[PDB]
């Protein structure tokens, strides 16, 4: 949802719905960590410095900052998808008449030649 109805407006973290459990050493976190390492390679190309990989040890700042911001960014991702599912399942149960079930049927269909 675009507009908030259950959650309070203007908040960095969820806080009201904290119980979800954040990811621990996720495959998504490794790619953001790789992007933090990738930024520490290209900065030595702009400011002409010897070796892309074996250069200065200011790269650790670039790795940490991408992981730190990314962890809070991934926390917002798992929260917003959960609220989306929570509102959707609650809408079906409240109405009941909107959803209809049909299962097990044998019906004829036209078959193509050649």
């Amino acid at each position: 949802x675009x507009x908030x109805x259950x959650x309070x407006x203007x908040x960095x973290x969820x806080x009201x719905x904290x119980x979800x459990x954040x990811x621990x050493x996720x495959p998504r976190l490794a790619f953001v960590g790789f992007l933090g390492y990738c930024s520490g390679l290209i900065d030595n190309a702009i400011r002409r410095r010897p070796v892309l990989l074996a250069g200065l040890h200011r790269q650790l700042l670039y790795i940490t900052s991408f992981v730190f911001v990314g962890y809070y960014l991934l926390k917002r991702q798992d929260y917003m998808y959960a609220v989306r599912d929570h509102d959707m399942f609650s809408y079906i149960k409240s109405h009941x008449x909107x959803x209809x079930x049909x299962x097990x049927x044998x019906x004829x269909x036209x078959x193509x030649x050649x």
Binding site: X3, X9, X10
Partner: protein, 89 residues
């Protein structure tokens, strides 16, 4: 707002609020109804339930519903010349 204000408030924007001294609005009777109808999210987004109270609010500020009514009275008084005239005042 894309980003809302927390703790500190800089409101006094909407009609029918805490008055400057004590003096109330001219349309305060119709202003109270619009807040009471549209306090829930599923009212203005639906825009069907509060249709009655919004039309009454349109009558207050524009006075268009009263303008066309008073126009008919003043025209008929001007049309009836030298035939059927009354002046109690």
């Amino acid at each position: 707002q894309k980003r809302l204000g927390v703790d500190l408030d800089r409101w006094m924007t909407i009609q029918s609020a805490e008055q400057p001294h004590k003096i109330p609005s001219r349309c305060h009777a119709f202003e109270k109804e619009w807040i009471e109808c549209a306090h829930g999210i599923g009212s203005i987004r639906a825009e069907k339930e509060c249709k009655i109270e919004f039309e009454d609010f349109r009558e207050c500020l524009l006075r268009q519903k009263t303008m066309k009514r008073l126009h008919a009275i003043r025209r008929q008084r001007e049309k009836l010349i030298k035939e059927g005239k009354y002046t109690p005042p």
